[PDB]
Design a protein around this ligand. Structure first.
Ligand SMILES: *[C@@H]1O[C@H](CO)[C@@H](O[C@@H]2O[C@H](CO)[C@@H](O[C@@H]3O[C@H](CO)[C@@H](O)[C@H](O)[C@@H]3O)[C@H](O)[C@H]2NC(C)=O)[C@H](O)[C@H]1NC(C)=O
Ligand SMILES: Ic1cccc(CNc2c3c(nc4ccccc24)CCCC3)c1
Ligand SMILES: Ic1cccc(CNc2c3c(nc4ccccc24)CCCC3)c1
Lengths: 537, 537
């Protein structure tokens, strides 16, 4: 078959789609690791046993075990992020979209987000059909273990012998393993293996970050696109000691004692591999208190992540790295609606009084000092623009700014200082069909479909300028993948640095100035310059 | 003569002016105290010895001893605030403007400003001709001792016996004495003595404040207009211990030892009364380090000012007090140009770099903690609006806001809470003929002429809307004087309180909303709410 490709591990058969007037060959569900199941739960992934026989790569693969948000039962806007294939631990599968400088096609690799607890390469929104077809590039995506399955971290609690029992970050080992698989097999799909670009969003973006900077993997890929996610972000890294404590709680939470981890770890681990995945899937969430602070995150392990993400950079040079990164306008709105659903509504705005503005602010930042809390509350106090609506708008800004936009900004400046050619974007279009509430603005993740070129899909409802924006945002990705520079011919989009923190604005509004420096600079000046000084007692 | 009026101390003869089509009788230079000279230097004023014979009250009286700012030699804009009659210690004279509810005319009494170091009732700008004529009210002004002459404070350094040797605040005793004189003689000028209104600007405004609230005088006048000056303001009150230290330096500075103040005060005081006034006039300024922190100020004396101005209010009710108060848009520009003339220009704006923005900010607020300095510097950091020009604009705002607008705001809220009917205004018109630099905006004191009705003077150059504004601002004063309420017929101008900090905006722009709450509330929220909390270690 011409839909058959001989991979490193055996022949695979795929589908043929014709989108945007070009043939793509779509291979979905290729095992890249042995199913991380039974004895291999919590462990590093091991390469998949080779096969022979055409492997059916025409259906979607499984979704790694996770829980579905049902805060709005039946609301399409929530469940399009829920798993759309069966959930199972057997989930380590790769997807390749392959069209029908000169030694093969560029390969783009997508890592999804979902806070290291959720997410799946199989979501419609991550369909690489159009990107591959129009970009004329190889696009690949894959599942990686999330939640406690990907991030249970207990090795310090156990003797040397039991290191590989629960080393932590195996979800990042998964990604490492799938990217290795794609390098190995780039040529078999018409792809140039030295021409690879990682890209992702939220936790996927931070994972792009980890894969570029980890000693375990660094050098393999040196060109990445990070959408609203950087490892310095508070939700995207976690100490080993906190990870262990979460792990110890989970072990207890699944009725497995955990106080025997030192005296007899092997038995505690057997117990945890006998637990049904659904039980882990639920009990891991007991350790979630704090908006945007998940129990699973890239963990300082002296291995994949050997130091805290900002002490990594003071010593490694990045002159050969190309980085495209950015943010959406309202990063924090849906996190705030979910974590404070008692206060807020999905569809309409909330006139939030001043005491309940304080109630929420003082909670979100309860772990900062009160000199920070007072400073933050003062920085986000509305005075104009009709109260209440404005207060909700400011708490959203604060969440977005503290958790995504300003960490991204800070990491973008640190990447530029060590030589990386950084390009920064800011996404400010609220899609016309968005059925999230108007007050929620331009949601975290709203940009993913645009960068994938989905507005080019004439079967989904979009306005002509939105299809223009999708064609522009996909083209920024394809040009970044192809040249390390997102800028089109004659389009001005200069490098981002501390000296000139210029970013590109993606909007349908042809009246705005596309290049801007000041507004993000001021927003995040508070978080990245002034607030550190407040923290000095 | 019909220009002759029999006062408490003898007959006085004045002038007849006809302005705005009404006859006014203008008596200038009426002694209200014995010349505070030789033995009476530094002492409380004593009532003037009665005379007989028509006293020539047709010329301007002397100016109390002070120094003239010559920062711009020949610039009319500076020297119209310099003394325009001879400077001398013999200066305690009153002025009455008297036209040609029902028991006499209202009496308005003007107290000039000049930082308790300068100023004179004789300035053209304080001409009450139009106000009296158009308002059809009695207007009075008078000289009061300024500088060390009015405020040398040494009684704590000396035994009980020598209390009256240098009690301090004699300049406020002067004003007390002239207001008493005007009550005594209100009827002789056609004025109703129970119908008196104090009004003033800068230090005069704070003096209006002191005269309304001092136990020495309170009850006499219960209706006042305070323009950019309140006693809580940092430049408008001073402890006794700091006053003594200033006094001790001056005594040393005039070559009189000062370390003998306790062992033999009488000799140290003789020495200081032998010093030429010009020497005191100069050496008192040696104790001026710090913008807006003059060596002379209303001093806590357990007498005229028995406590710190904000601990006074927590115990006295003001239900019968009417207070009209307010601010100009750019309170701090000329103070900043004078104290930082090396940096800035009179006519054109300064592109102030960021390090020199810090140089000035860190100096002006050098005495605040660094947690305040960092907070203030962050609160006034420009990001947009073209740098440099913007930085100068923000340091001006900070000075204006910290030194006048926010203390006034704070005192206005405290006055309303204790029952006073407060009305708040905000003056935002830059006069067309202003030959100060455009960047200096609407200067501190720019409003005085408008409230005096000077734009009604057809011989000075003003635009028609400026004459409208003068006619409106004079009418706010006359209506406030007559009814305790500045509001015209059908004009909405509601009471100012913490609950509803609404103010009236005086502008020639007919496009703005005259009533506003939010913009001052936000400006001063920083100074009056948030910064106090920063001050907590
Ligand atoms: C563009 O947008 C349209 C929707 O407007 C997308 O159409 C969707 O295509 C997928 C796959 O082609 C359909 O899923 C399939 O369903 C059948 C049975 O219903 C199943 O046998 C397949 O294995 C697959 O699961 C989906 O139903 C369809 N939805 C609609 C509303 O048409 C299209 O994929 C988008 N992308 C492009 C590049 O056109
Ligand atoms: I972690 C997390 C916290 C709260 C809600 C969710 C639900 N999943 C969601 C995801 C994304 N966008 C969404 C937009 C609206 C509502 C839910 C979304 C994009 C990437 C991660 C998953 C996940
Ligand atoms: I204290 C002080 C500090 C700096 C400059 C001066 C000069 N005197 C001045 C006064 C007033 N307005 C002015 C406007 C521009 C320039 C100088 C002005 C109004 C009342 C006090 C005196 C006084």
């Amino acid at each position: 078959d011409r839909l058959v490709v001989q991979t490193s591990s055996g022949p695979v058969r795929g589908r043929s789609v014709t989108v945007q007037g070009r043939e793509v060959h779509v291979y979905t569900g290729i095992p890249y690791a042995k199913p991380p199941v039974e004895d291999l739960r919590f462990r590093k992934p091991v390469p998949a046993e080779p096969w022979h026989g055409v492997l059916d790569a025409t259906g979607l693969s499984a979704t790694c075990v996770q829980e579905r948000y049902e805060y709005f039962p039946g609301f399409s806007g929530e469940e399009i992020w829920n798993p759309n294939t069966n959930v199972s631990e057997d989930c380590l599968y790769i997807n390749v979209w392959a069209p029908a400088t000169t030694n093969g096609l560029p390969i783009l690799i997508w890592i999804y987000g979902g806070g290291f607890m959720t997410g799946s390469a199989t979501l419609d929104i991550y369909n690489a059909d159009i990107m591959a077809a129009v970009g004329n590039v190889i696009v690949a995506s894959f599942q990686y273990r999330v939640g406690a399955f990907g991030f249970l971290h207990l090795a310090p609690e156990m003797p040397s012998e039991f290191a590989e029992e629960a080393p932590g970050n195996v979800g990042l080992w998964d990604q490492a393993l799938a990217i290795r698989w794609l390098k190995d097999n780039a040529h078999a799909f018409g792809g140039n293996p030295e021409w690879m670009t990682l890209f992702g969003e939220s936790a996927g973006s931070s994972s792009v970050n980890a894969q570029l900077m980890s000693p375990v993997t660094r050098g393999l890929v040196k060109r990445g696109m990070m959408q609203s996610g950087t490892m310095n972000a508070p939700w995207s890294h976690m100490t080993s000691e906190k990870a262990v404590e979460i792990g110890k709680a989970l072990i207890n939470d699944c009725n497995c004692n955990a106080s025997m981890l030192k005296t007899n770890p092997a038995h505690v681990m057997s117990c945890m591999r006998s637990v049904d995945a659904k039980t882990i899937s639920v009990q891991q969430w007991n350790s979630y208190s704090g908006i945007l602070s998940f129990p699973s995150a890239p963990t300082i392990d002296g291995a994949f992540l050997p130091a805290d993400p900002m002490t990594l950079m003071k010593t490694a040079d990045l002159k050969d790295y190309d980085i495209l990164m950015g943010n959406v306008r309202d990063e924090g709105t849906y996190f705030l609606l979910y974590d404070f659903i008692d206060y807020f509504d999905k569809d309409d705005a909330t006139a939030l009084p001043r005491d309940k503005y304080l109630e929420i602010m003082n909670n979100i930042f309860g772990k900062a000092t009160q000199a920070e809390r007072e400073a933050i509350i003062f920085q986000y106090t509305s005075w104009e623009g009709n109260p209440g609506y404005q207060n909700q708008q400011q708490i959203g800004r604060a969440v977005g700014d503290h958790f995504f936009t300003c960490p991204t900004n800070e990491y973008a400046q640190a990447l530029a200082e060590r030589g990386a050619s950084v390009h920064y974007y800011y996404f400010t279009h609220r899609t016309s069909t968005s059925l999230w509430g108007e007050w929620m603005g331009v949601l975290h993740g709203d940009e993913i479909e645009y960068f994938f070129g989905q507005p080019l899909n004439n079967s989904l409802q979009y306005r002509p300028v939105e299809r223009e924006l999708g064609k522009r945002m996909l083209s920024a990705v394809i040009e970044f993948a192809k040249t390390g520079n997102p800028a089109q011919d004659g389009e001005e989009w200069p490098n981002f640095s501390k000296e000139d923190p210029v970013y590109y604005i993606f909007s349908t509004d042809d009246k705005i100035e596309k290049l801007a420096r000041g507004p993000l600079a001021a927003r995040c000046s508070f978080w990245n310059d002034y607030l550190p000084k407040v923290r000095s007692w």
